[PDB]
Design a protein around this ligand. Structure first.
Ligand SMILES: CCc1c(-c2csc(N3CCNC[C@@H]3C(=O)NCC(C)(C)C)n2)[nH]c(C)c1C(C)=O
Ligand SMILES: [Mg+2]
Length: 102
């Protein structure tokens, strides 16, 4: 039941217009300094894969990964960059959906 809500939230994030920076892992070969600055990368497909194999024991673990996506986004990208702007939309979306489930 805890995992049901995560499937709904993850499905909605995956299909969101603003999800485009977060659908796949950042390729550090293409992004100078990413490996240096971001210690714990995370993205929606990594969450999908972990959800698929049953690798989340609780919804709190799922939310930790979601928040990590947006913490990494704000650590690496300017708030007015295209990726930063998309990350703020996605972060607010996640927080608001998470709250109306718990
Ligand atoms: C800015 C990199 C980044 C992305 C991301 C995922 S798809 C994407 N793009 C697609 C089309 N044009 C804009 C941009 C792009 O390819 N720019 C060229 C590079 C910089 C890849 C050489 N960007 N997602 C996250 C979370 C990122 C970071 C650094 O946090
Ligand atoms: Mg926080």
């Amino acid at each position: 039941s805890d995992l049901t809500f995560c499937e709904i939230i993850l499905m909605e994030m995956e299909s969101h217009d603003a999800a485009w920076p977060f659908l796949e892992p950042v390729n550090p070969r293409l992004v100078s300094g990413y490996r240096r600055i971001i210690k714990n990368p995370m993205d929606f497909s990594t969450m999908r894969h972990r959800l698929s194999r049953g690798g989340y024991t609780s919804s709190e673990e799922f939310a930790a990964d979601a928040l990590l996506v947006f913490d990494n986004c704000q650590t690496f990208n300017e708030d007015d960059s295209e990726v930063g702007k998309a990350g703020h939309i996605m972060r607010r979306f996640f927080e608001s959906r998470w709250e109306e489930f718990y």
